[PDB]
Subunit: 68 residues, 2 copies
């Protein structure tokens, strides 16, 4: 029902040994691109994070995808 | 840097227990007046939403206000 917090997303990545620095460098992104997606909706960055967690972005961000 | 999305603005209002239906009725607005401001710039309606969130509209819509000159 409620969106994941930045702290939920980061922790879950750390569970699988991923970092935002590492996941940004890998996909060729600017630093804040993934960090900003923790607070403010950006579909293409959310698809990258969802797939890193074997998920659909709609399950991490149910509200973001309902409020559009 | 980038403007807030409709989903960012809505969510933030819901955080404080506000809805667009409620905020429209309060300020005497037509339904779509606030909804349209989520997509397309309208200064006086965005000033209303900013103040509901203890903010300046320039922080919610940095691009709209930079893309005005």
């Amino acid at each position: 029902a409620q969106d994941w917090h930045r702290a939920d997303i980061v922790a879950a990545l750390h569970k699988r040994g991923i970092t935002l620095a590492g996941l940004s460098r890998a996909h060729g992104l600017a630093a804040r691109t993934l960090s900003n997606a923790m607070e403010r909706h950006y579909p293409r960055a959310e698809r990258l994070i969802a797939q890193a967690l074997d998920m659909r972005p709609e399950d991490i961000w149910p509200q973001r995808y309902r409020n559009k």
